[PDB]
Design a protein around this ligand. Sequence first.
Ligand SMILES: C[C@H](OC(=O)c1ccc(CN2C(=O)c3ccccc3C2=O)cc1)c1cccc2c(-c3ccc(CN4CCOCC4)nc3)c(C(=O)O)[nH]c12
Ligand SMILES: [Zn+2]
Ligand SMILES: [Zn+2]
Length: 232
Amino acid sequence: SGEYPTVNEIPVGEVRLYQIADGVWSHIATQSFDGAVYPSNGLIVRDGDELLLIDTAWGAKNTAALLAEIEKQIGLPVTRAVSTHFHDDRVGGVDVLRAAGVATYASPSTRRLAEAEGNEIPTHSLEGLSSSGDAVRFGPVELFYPGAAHSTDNLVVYVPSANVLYGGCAVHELSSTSAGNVADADLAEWPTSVERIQKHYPEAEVVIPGHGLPGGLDLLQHTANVVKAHKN
Ligand SMILES: C[C@H](OC(=O)c1ccc(CN2C(=O)c3ccccc3C2=O)cc1)c1cccc2c(-c3ccc(CN4CCOCC4)nc3)c(C(=O)O)[nH]c12
Ligand SMILES: [Zn+2]
Ligand SMILES: [Zn+2]
């Protein structure tokens, strides 16, 4: 009923959308992994009379449910998708997307890591993102590579028309007491990568984490704090 939807509010297999700004939505789904249930976020950005999708809904059936929810709530076709790193909460569902006619994209680093790990593989490579601080335009968003953080390949996404910063899994929600799933992370570089985000997007008004509730710019400093304390 209007609040940001939480893990116990979304059965695994259902997807909810949340309006962030004009022409910007998050998508929220839940998935089981190693015997626990987790929420995750992605982004939808209006691209004229089409939509750009950022990240899958963490699985094939969730991603099919995402497409159905978009058709119900928005009614514009998803034509392109970008996955922000190689983990299943970002690429799981890419095969569903591709068979639905969506062109799928990721950095070459993400594509290599996904292939090596046995995850679904986006079709098209996003060049121009291999050095920290790199940025490229992609429809109505800017893609930014901040450096290694949650993963070595993690990208962030900025929507300039709305000053929305989608941090993906490099950014944690304010209630987080832990650095999340850090198995592929660089804890030493992560604060430096967050500092790059902070420097590049000082006008961000909404910050969306990979998992959990959106907030403001404080999510960035909070993330650096949590990662440093985890390493400590
Ligand atoms: C889907 C994602 O898989 C992973 O990451 C992950 C990593 C490493 C392997 C390990 N491997 C390999 O090397 C390998 C090589 C070859 C073949 C197969 C594999 C393989 O399987 C698996 C999977 C995920 C699965 C399950 C959970 C998560 C979380 C998460 C989010 C939030 C919290 C709770 N907090 C509150 C909010 O703030 C942070 C703390 N806790 C965890 C977050 C995230 O943090 O983004 N990603 C998660
Ligand atoms: Zn991840
Ligand atoms: Zn994640």
